[model samples]
Target chain A: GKKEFLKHEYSPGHWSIDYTRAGTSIAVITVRNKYHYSVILNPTDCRGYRIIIRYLNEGDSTLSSAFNRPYTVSEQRGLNDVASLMTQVYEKLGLIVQFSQLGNNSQSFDKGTGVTLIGSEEEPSMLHLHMWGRGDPDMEYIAGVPLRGPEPGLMFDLIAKNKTHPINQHAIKWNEEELKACLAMFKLKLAEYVNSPEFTEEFGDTLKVTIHDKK
Target chain B: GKKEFLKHEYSPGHWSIDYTRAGTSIAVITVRNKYHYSVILNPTDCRGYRIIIRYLNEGDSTLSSAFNRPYTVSEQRGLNDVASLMTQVYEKLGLIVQFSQLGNNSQSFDKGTGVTLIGSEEEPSMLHLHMWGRGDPDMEYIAGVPLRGPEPGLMFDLIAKNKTHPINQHAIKWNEEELKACLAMFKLKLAEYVNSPEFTEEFGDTLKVTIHDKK
Candidate 1:
């Protein structure tokens, strides 16, 4: 008798938006075209994403709060690589996602002067992005500090991929109970850890929860 | 002796000035900061970087020309990963960089908004950045098109990283003849392509050239 093998078929598709240098009050949603409903979360206190569990893999992932502009891909290929790897993990793991473009919004011009107030939380509109390997001078990665909520910093560590640095390594595990709690805050229910049998057929790996934060 | 296994080292420092966000203006950079100025040159209208270049290894990457918001690491870990990877490459390659924080010179939110705009001929200023990502969206292994430049649709096709998209997955090599003639009109120097390795080292590896009707 052959053991039962669940067919793998659930791999989510992704979406990304990038505007190189857009200005003017612009907005284009899946349903609407007006874009100014957008607002900046509190930068000084580092709160938001509470009902949601979010983390940044870069030093000062938050632009304006710590750095001036958003992340750039040309300066750091690692950022691209990181996104590539994590996107696979999340897709296989069945996580939701949204990627916004950096530095294309229509705010104003006079606000920007120089680098005197990076990470001040005063200017949430600052730029803090670059291509891979380009460390942000405006932002600083802190140790053991949850940005938007408790355990926010658990998964997000500013560790250098191939080198050693002060903000170089941080990881944490989440138990089923903790996962449920977090998900509940977001009004999400984990029916069960599902997998794509087609994926197994192609790569021969069951989509099982191999690593849990609590494990 | 075997070739030295040298690691990439970037200066990783940036400075900022002021620029009006809405309309275009010019920054009066002194001789001292000439080396610090960002001199970006878009490829010919015939061939250029696609609007999007999503790294297949990473999450979906796209560029937009219409004004979009900044992607924050805290809101989206992918942003952090991408930024870090770029930082590393910048360090290894020694490219010019200027963070948005560098744009915010003084801590006075007096300016209308906070976004910076700079090009070979445009002025510099800080602008607004927005956030929009959830856990890490599914669109992986892709890059978007950039929306800005002297032309439209022109920049979009150039930045798209979809090598298979017919527009990407090729090189926009500049020949001595093209440089000689085009340089004078564009105010480019022949030495730019011949003397600087950035031409072949950076720009050559990417971009797919195509034919277009004269506008």
Candidate 2:
């Protein structure tokens, strides 16, 4: 914890990366798990957050991701299971489950440069592999066959009563083009996080925000 | 003059900042005039360039700009005169004419952040003033009434001949909403300069690229 910001878990048991409000806000993010990791994104842009993950498995001997099928609304259930919902909850485990052995080069992604995953977002959700040549070499953009979606919050992010009593259908399964577009917008939004002073105002530096293995 | 990139005056008399392809590119911009000034935009987003100008004549003891009516197609003139010309030639003097006593605190706009002028472009092309409070103490956003356009390149950036002989007309005059949108977009394009690895490739580090007091 540096100053001004605080960190806490969500009701669904997920952690918050609340960027502190020092902006003009500087923020330090701590991700606690099997291996501990810390990151500071001044400007406090989320690309730093994403890039931190890339360099984590830097040299790629540890991080790996798989493609699972899109989660179904009728098919998905519960607060967890799979899917890195556009929301926070599953985004936690969704990412945590894929990588192993993490480290920060201290300067690589830290000094403002980064890595982007043009691959996936959690459905038929095969974890996106790092496709950009500049990032960690080992991370694959995508590999293996796809599987079904994850639990509610994500795969079935929005929930309706279900067409029938127990049948649930989430949203439309994204096509390749749509998936690419979605990821592009996602990065753009991440950049917005850097631009917004309010966000950092609310999510300053504090405790730990991370994912763990519960499944 | 530095390394790699080259600097020379343009045909119509404009200096090139040739960013020298150094991505992750770090660049130094020198704007020479009666007072002489310099700037370095590592990521090299033009924001630094714009901000540097704001801090110049810091106390506002010197700089001043006026609104100019939009350039006319059938009404414009030669290689000189008014217009900031979205292009280079006039961008030189267009900015140079408005100020005096330029100094770099060595830190003010030098570090990273800077001021933005939302007021005008090259039209009734009123020159914009610094609107943000965080910048210099003296600079006014816009004070005087308005005037006419600049030269060929800027206010009348794109060119076409008139139907009749001696007459020439430029393009459309942007309305308030359009002007604001154009400026916002201009900032976004400036940011792209920071991201493109190739642009830096073409325009690498070189000698002094600047706009001088010629008019």
Candidate 3:
């Protein structure tokens, strides 16, 4: 029971699949969560510590994610809701959640290549997803929906840590324009398959539509 | 000698290399006296074409020197004065011009980085530079400066191209604080190198500096 959460280090919590005219392809993402406990050497005064959660998807490229969020147990309402936040991300990504020790955790978000989201200074955590296409037909490496932003930082992150917060509200939203731009690419590819005069009745069912709610 | 101009695919008045560098060091560039050229297919009707010359010295990480003046030529004015332009670049770099060429020649900058700087262009032609670099000590490959810019077919470029006109005089100049801010990186490295115990003797004559000059 104690080692249950340790299992995620072996298997990823989320799987992403790429869809094309033919069928679906799949890829797994691995997550890493780090916890920090702070102590004062001089005063021995009880000031709270920092918690960081990072994730990495290993492939040809090391798609690693990091976040650094701080928490003051006394400053806020005593850090009771930390477990729920982590669980929300876990459930959202379709991964099972297990806890080692409860309460007082923070996440960090800093990624070099892809998009990153930021919350307030009080809660500066990052959520990241690392993925790569291995050019393999056997494993069916899937390419997720492409992300578009005004720029790389602070917009349309592969993972969203906090959506309702004001600081993050302006940070970046996965709006209709970006979503349509990404999905439009898929639609274009699909059109090619449909436009082909060759009649293959088996190909009909392969073209189902997918809808994602933005609001 | 007359047929030599026309014998190759690139004619003397067409795209060709006018000058080369010492074992491919700093190259003196030349172009056809007349012709419209296409760089990425946006018409460059250079009544005269000009390149602002700059150089980084041996083993220098930054480029700090630019010609006090610009090197410019049009077919109507001729390529004879270009040698003086190249001379100023060599003088700034403290490099001796050992090898040089003119008219209907070709040179490589980084040796098969697939970068070919053909020296000349005929009427309705494209602009080009015959480039070479001062090779590293082993002298096996080129230690070249990077030649990059925004691709053509944009209005901002047109504005930039016209900015140097005497009547226009819109070229932006970097001031003292701005200059220091710009060279903050080089200054930081220079401080590190100066403070290190082995700063001198080993890296004594090898301190590379970047010079930025306007107009």
Candidate 4:
């Protein structure tokens, strides 16, 4: 008999899709029995990173469905659950999770480009995600969710005394404004990160130095 | 006889080289009848844009000498006048000039790189300079300084009605503290420029977006 090492488990998860008439669309779901991740498509004619998501869960199909099939009102309601869960996670964990958007096509967060999420287990983890639109009849890439690590809880914790205790509170409940706040926090953190020294030094050449004579 | 118009004049500017034992070498001289410009060579084994300057005086040989000749204490004292004029420029013009350094064969200032100076003549001009080292037998490129514009005064202005104007009288003489403060401001501006939204959005993609299947 071989020994099975279950690093982490996922609670049963469902998926759903949603779209606002104003052109903001999203497909979200639960994952890893802890995090809620989503793929968001914002208004048309916008540039830069627009897609957003937190963490992910297993047994979820909304992301795959949204990318593969056409959107329906029914799916939006389902994805809304994941959004609500994000709020619950914030309420119980007291951890402000920022969504690092990876837009429709990109490679890495340029140095001084990504947000710094400090936690007890992680070394100021810089998180990122990719979000894109569902093209007519087909999609360019699947754009799957990337997990931060095997032990996200190692990175998710509150303040003193009850440090990593939120890992056990995964069964808590959720609502609407919670998701809005989480997403809002994502925008704020992003504005902060892009406006931070850590982001600039990492991604940009502040000074363009050279040693060439003008001929 | 056709009268040829000379747009600007350079006095019979002399050239001189100077160096501190710490390896901070500079070739400095006069320009524009009221300003001094110089090319500086810093010490060894460091990277990134570290040396900075605002505007250069044309057609003197200290820049050529430092890159081509040996360091003698004799030239150091001659270039001291340029250092003094920088303070004078600040006093007479009521402007704060910040220098941007290009290191000895270095590239850019990380996020906390570069310096900023504000003026009404130009659209908040962001100026830069290239700095290089002196090789023993032969000189590397002299890396000529770039002028902010054909006319430097398009970038200089002063007014007493404006509170930000020197906030004092032009009769104020300059000392080592003035130069030190200008250089310090340059460092701070460079730091802010590298950390700005314009810097990140224009030059850096903090995160790359995409689509893929989650395994």
Candidate 5:
């Protein structure tokens, strides 16, 4: 048959409670409800969908200096176009998706904020997120790290990582309550994932990358 | 340049915090984050955008025999196909859009539930919603009425409409706390709408339908 990819739209302000399978491999996209950022599934080389998103299509704006709220991904229509295109490819060739939302990422581009590790396919290895997007902030994106497993400079990178500028650690300024909230939400997604035959039967029960200890 | 509607995807689990405008008139789709039903904006003629959605694309299931949960619109991909296609037309030619989600709605077919009033353009007037698609159980679709305005049998219809079968009143079984929660959530969306420059300027400061007396 002719090549094609499955499509589904989240309406506007929603993210996947869990990943959906498309083609041989599917890119499961996740984002906080109001936070200006989005991270798809965590990718891995395998037989079926692993629900991976290393490179996120996050939104940011430098035009406004407003600070009462966390930095929000401007819902510029064009950026969504970009995210869709990337997921479009991931489903087409059983390939990996690594692209940024097509909008201003300048505010989040400073210092360690942009610091990340990418694989041959362009997915990020060194992942971190901050409520303020580099904080002047938030997952409501906790699921980005394997339902709820481990990713070295990923979670650790969020709360405490010596490699990045202190400001870019993202979660360094967050209270434990917030951290716990993320964990609780992760459990919600995890419980659903592990229970879903469509997902667990493929991605399996999960993984832990190198601790990336301070060297 | 070619003409088209501005597109944005809600990933799968999202709905507009308010409404978005495309060409002439825009649709303000509102759905409970997880409910199988969605009600857009209330329609009225005239300039700018009234942010209306008379007819809704709801989901239903009959095979599961499950009762622990509510009637979930199968995110069966096909239903999504119908929703996008409908929104696609609404954004084009400044015409009215009306269509179903392209899937089974049989479970909700009992009686009064299907009783709806429609205009020539196919928009609904006799509106009502139930948690279980008629019985089994849900808004996270409250925004479908109005930011918080009146829609005759709408909210009243949800809780106590004599026209529909008692079961179709939707909210008959809901506790006061749940109703209040729905109101509180509406206030959240309403506050944001009144505050946004994009929506308020177009829709105006609101709505009411007659007592639809016991005729």
Candidate 6:
């Protein structure tokens, strides 16, 4: 089978994506609203689909400032690109997703005074990434320590030290299988890792992907 | 002269106020710009204007949520009405304004986030209002006190006790003549004083106007 590129103009603007030859042939679905526009893969491949990307592709100057670096690309666009590329590798390997976007509630995390991203549908577990990125400005003083940037081992360090903060309740849940797949994808292509499911560079300038399953 | 209502349509959606005949006759000058609009009261009266009101009139939803109760009247419009009324009283008295927009700065105080005020051109002493309001959230705990609402006495109390926070450096300065004028105006009208020159209702929901020249 060969790759298929599908484009659809449902309402105001349109969305299209390249669907590679995978387990089954599927069409790209397009959704548009005042706030955002999304291109979704369908046909219940695994739980839903392998590659899911959510991006805000158009808007005014104020809107642009809120998402993109004043103009280049929106945070959602960047994050989606990373997620899609990673998922593309898995799709090539022919793996079906068991389940995703579980639970009733979703969360949004803001960067600085701008750029907000709602939790991923294909990855409800992505909430933990935002939680850690929040950095808890007041938490540092409460724990009797100076404010520090997010680090690869910060989450683990806090748990091991028995430190607590309000955001801990939304801690990231690790899926061993998913983690392995992400690492393998990263190894295959030496690409920028920020905003990927396996990595985040929100708080600190450096990309980090730390997990704390122990203690 | 009794009173004259002068209207000017220099730009789209113009604004006009009643010009009253008082101590002296003056011309009304209208100015427009991207950031702000101004209606100037020319000719000198007192050393400068009596009561100054600084507010953010034009802003997005984020600003409205910051100052308003989700909707209804915006903070700037409400404050401007109060300031205009005060100016009305002086206009009836037939006095000339020596200067206005005094000092070198004017300030805008943001709740929870922090204090931010642009320097006043006529008065550099406008910072006291924001200083008391900035009462750092952490400082409240350090003082062994529970989180408390703003009280008219809080600003005076902080100053009397020599209690300080980073924001205190922007504290308000007392102008004897301006204070006297404000108090005199209040005494003459015995106004309701919800959010007035002699007082402000920003920090707390309740009306408060505490002053302390000596402690």
Cα lDDT, all candidates: 0.22, 0.21, 0.21, 0.25, 0.23, 0.24
Q: Give the per-residue lDDT digits (tens) of candidate 6, residues B1-215.
A: 11111222222111111212222112111111111222222112221222323332333322112221111112222332233333433323322111111111222223344222322222222111111111122222212322122211111112111112222212234344543443344334323333344324221332222221211
Per-residue lDDT of A1-215 in model 5, one digit per residue for the tens? 11111122222222222222221112223322222223332222111112223223343532122211221113222223223323322222221222211111111111223221111111111122111110000111332211121111011111212222223223222234433343344334334443266443322322111111112
lDDT, candidate 4, A1-215, per-residue tens: 01111122222231222223333333334322433344343332221113433232224433222231111212222222233222222222222122211111211111232211121121111122322111111111112211111121121111112221223212112223333433344334334444556434432432111111112
Give the TM-score (vs. native) of candidate 1: 0.24
DockQ of 5: 0.02
Worst lDDT 10-window in candidate 2 chain A: A100-109
User: How many steric clashes between backbone atoms does each model show?
Assistant: 128, 55, 32, 34, 31, 31
For every prediction, compared with the true complex, DockQ reads 0.03, 0.01, 0.01, 0.01, 0.02, 0.01
> Please, what are the lDDT tens digits per residue for candidate 5 over residues B53-121?
222233343212221122121322212222332232222222121121110111112122322111111
TM-score of each model, in listed order: 0.24, 0.16, 0.18, 0.16, 0.22, 0.17
Query: Which candidate comes out best when scored by DockQ?
Result: 1
The most accurate candidate by TM-score is 1
lDDT of 3 by residue, A122-167 (tens): 3322222111111111211113322211111111112223322222
Comparing to the true complex, what docking class would candidate 5 get? incorrect
CAPRI accuracy category, model 3: incorrect
Model 3 off-target regions past 4 Å? Answer: A1-65, A69-181, A184-215, B1-174, B181-187, B190-215
Model 1 agreement with the true structure over B5-88: per-residue lDDT tens digits = 112222213121211221111111111111111111223221221111111111223111111222222223322332332232
Candidates in descending lDDT order:
4, 6, 5, 1, 3, 2
lDDT of 5 at A198: 45
Compose the digit string of candidate 2's lDDT tens values, residues A103-178.
1110011112222111121111111111001111122222211212221111111222211133233333434443
Q: Between the candidate structures 2 and 4, which one is better when assessed by DockQ?
A: 4
CA lDDT for candidate 2: 0.21
As for TM-score, the candidate ahead, 3 or 4, is 3
What is the overall TM-score of model 5 with all chains considered together?
0.22
Per-model B-chain TM-score: 0.22, 0.23, 0.22, 0.22, 0.22, 0.26
TM-score of chain A of each: 0.24, 0.25, 0.19, 0.24, 0.22, 0.21
The superposed Cα distance between candidate 1 and the true structure at residue B64, in angstroms, equals 23
